[PDB]
Design a binder for this molecule. Sequence first.
Ligand SMILES: [Mg+2]
Ligand SMILES: [Mg+2]
Lengths: 134, 134, 96, 144, 336, 48
Amino acid sequence: LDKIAIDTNILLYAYDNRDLDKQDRAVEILLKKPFVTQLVVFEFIKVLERRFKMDKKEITKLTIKLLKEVIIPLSLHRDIYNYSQFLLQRYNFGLSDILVLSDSILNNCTILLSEDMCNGMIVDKKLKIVNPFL
Amino acid sequence: LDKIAIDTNILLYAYDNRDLDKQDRAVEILLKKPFVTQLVVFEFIKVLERRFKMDKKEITKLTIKLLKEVIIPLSLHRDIYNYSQFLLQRYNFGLSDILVLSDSILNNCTILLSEDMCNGMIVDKKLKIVNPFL
Amino acid sequence: QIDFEKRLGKFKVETEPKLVWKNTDGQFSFLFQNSFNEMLEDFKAAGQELKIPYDWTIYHLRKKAISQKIEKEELAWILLNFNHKRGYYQLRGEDF
Amino acid sequence: PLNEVIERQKQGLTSVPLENEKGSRLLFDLSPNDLVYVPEIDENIDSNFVFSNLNKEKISRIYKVEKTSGTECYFVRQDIAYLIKQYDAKTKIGELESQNKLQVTMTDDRIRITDTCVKINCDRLGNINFITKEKIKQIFNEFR
Amino acid sequence: KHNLESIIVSFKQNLRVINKATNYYEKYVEKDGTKNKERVEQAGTNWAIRKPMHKDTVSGKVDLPWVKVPKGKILTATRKSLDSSFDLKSIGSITDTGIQKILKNYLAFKDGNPELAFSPEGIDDLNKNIEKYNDGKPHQPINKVRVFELGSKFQVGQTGNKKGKYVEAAKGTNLFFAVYEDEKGKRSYETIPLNEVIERQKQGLTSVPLENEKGSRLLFDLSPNDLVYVPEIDENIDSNFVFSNLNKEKISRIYKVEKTSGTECYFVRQDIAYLIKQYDAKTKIGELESQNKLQVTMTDDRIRITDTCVKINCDRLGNINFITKEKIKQIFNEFR
Amino acid sequence: KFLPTVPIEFSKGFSKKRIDHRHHALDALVIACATTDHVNLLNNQSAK
DNA sequence: TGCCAGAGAATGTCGGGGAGCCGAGGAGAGATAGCT
RNA sequence: UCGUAACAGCCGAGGUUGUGAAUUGCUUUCAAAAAUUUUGAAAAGCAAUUCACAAUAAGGAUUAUUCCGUUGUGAAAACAUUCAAGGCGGGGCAACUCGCCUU
DNA sequence: AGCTATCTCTCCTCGGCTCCCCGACATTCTCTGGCATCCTTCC
Ligand SMILES: [Mg+2]
Ligand SMILES: [Mg+2]
């Protein structure tokens, strides 16, 4: 009994077509109905519009379908900025990453899945960051 | 009598002092307690960290102070993606701009104080874009 | 159940150990059955009926230790009990 | 109400709001002739999925929405077409009481369906459709 | 006359809930190869709680099936000595049913009079002859009983058996009163107990949650001895600003918080020091009503304060602080 | 003019100045405007 | 025209603002041991 | 005539919640039994008398026979405390404590 | 043996702490009412 969140890299590795095994790992991650911050949704949309040059209408269609059935979006918590400042004291992460971490924690997420952090490292004795691909 | 929202460029001109007159206009606009959407806040944070190279802690402090005193943040709406899809049928703006417009409209905002958004025309007969620097 | 390397002598976290109690498959058992049986025989000699609490054994040990030999765990129990109730140490200016 | 649905669909949004003002995420909407499954009282269904092992009991615990008013939703066991005896005002005896349908399960348990029901969608041939790894693969294989 | 009638009274406030803890402790340190005793600071983040967290009495939670439990409410229990203050009503508050039966039977045996029944002599008589009132069954003697109570109590802590002990907030620790606003226009009032405030501040957050479970935006929080302004009935306003030239009437429409309980916040006009006549409950006549506090304005309109009040912050000298065209510029200049 | 008044039963331990905080500011203003001439005239430093 | 949506009728539960009790620091009122 | 009165320090014994135990109790649940009624076993909830033990403001350091955690200042989530040597001496079997003289 | 000044023995209004209605608002199930009349084309 625990709550799981994810990061933008997981959605991208699901969408990308050059890491077939990582594609798999991503897809059976999504079979469990993970949660997402709105931040990773916005970053995913920006990356799709920027990196893959895939047009806006299809971006919106895909994200609507994903948020509708694949994933459960998380309400953007109001205490995100204060808590992000609090976590920013001792963890030397990017401000985007710490924002994701803070809003994930504030929504009672117990495990975060990603690759851009310290695998297994614990933040504020509340959340555990895991690299599911390794 | 009518709600008012702002775009990231308003905050950027309020902070940056390369053109003093536009900075004064932006400060005057901020004096009236204007509403703001969280996407604008995140874009502002990203720009400050990237363009102006301010460190994380001062950026977070500035954001917290601004939200506590100067501006009213708007809660993120659950219908942002569907409406953004709807708005794309008639209007051809950037995807981030479309998201900003959708979140502003869904929160009953009637004026969007922006600059780089081809001011003047109504949007969906609910909101209008106004350039305050002209 | 007690740390001895970093937090010296402190109980391990979320542990509430009893010295005279051993847990086996969640079943708690006394640790000094011999002295307990000695107390039962003594109370039988005194005429008191039966079925006395297990943990009275501390006082039989304390009386016994004055003249006889007791086990090392019993000695540790007695010392940790003496740590509890040091007693009153009157200072200057009072007679009582 | 139909007015809200009309306005929401005209705006391009979905028929049912994603988030009530109470601050609760929308689990699902229900329409007439929809299918729901009521799990057993003992069991806990949160991410069960696996809707191919439909035996007698699981299928027999499938209900259908019939009508709706306010916060009251009425269900009928999906295999029931005509009631054995319809309700009457004089003798006041009926197979499914005065409303000819119950807000709860028909069996002896009498548990409110809406508290534990899970929505189920099916194709024309009466086959249950649930997400699979291949479906998740294709859902954005198509956009590529 | 003008200056005296244009004065706002400044109240010193200290809302210390947590603070940094200073710990100078002596230990052996190595300098130039020699180990010497010297006092050092404590390393890390140490928080000192600056308020009495809870009351002294500690209660344990019980589950009595024969008692209806209101939602959001907790049933606890506590040992108490058996004395003459126990009547047939009091015996109904004892957790143990068999003790209730024995005690009621013995009390009836002595004319239902607690004074003789529950004197120490009566307790001794019951203890020495407990067989009669317990259906002839044996029973261990009785000296104390665990009476149960119904109320709002919270655990002392989490580690160890500190989760098994339930306490209640210390008197005078109700220091926060949140007022939230919804998009509809309705104002919601709430009181935040202390322990949540300690938790939030330890997390680095604000004292009061910025939105309640309604989702309503938080208008403002209130603590004892802060000043609010109550607008006129025909002057329904949002912020009204104009806080640099308040007239006699604007100043005269300023109220101050003293007591917060439940959803109730009690106010007295800021310039009122001592009432002409202290309220008497017997005669029900005085300058102010019961508790010498009013939730409504003194004037004849008698409008409830919490409905239209707007918080105003006042510095030491009596001035009112409001955002200006320059404070924003200093805000930006601080970070550049 | 109509001056403030308190009935006998309610006038035990009553003060006009004690009812409002502003009497402190009034006292400050009064003591401020009195010059050294005022203080050494009301202290009878010239009485002899 | 059968049946859908909502009015309609019995309940039980809860805020909430007065009624009535009632714990508690503190003042007459005095027996009394230290003092004369 | 002011001031002195405030701040600190070494200890004690309970109580409460909880864990384990000995002995009894009250209620509830399948009947195991008797000829619609009782005797009941076993569990659960609630205790009582006594014993041992854990915690005793949430919590954080440290391995000194040291602590910090209900005071004050104010955003810096930052602080307050201590301050080298030399003998002379009193006390104390001891640990150590207390004064005087000299830069 | 007699005076008194520090205790103790009992009444009080205040600050609380339960009753205490009283009206309003969920739940659960059951009645009840509903646009009707209108001709040709029109086979
Ligand atoms: Mg990331
Ligand atoms: Mg933009």
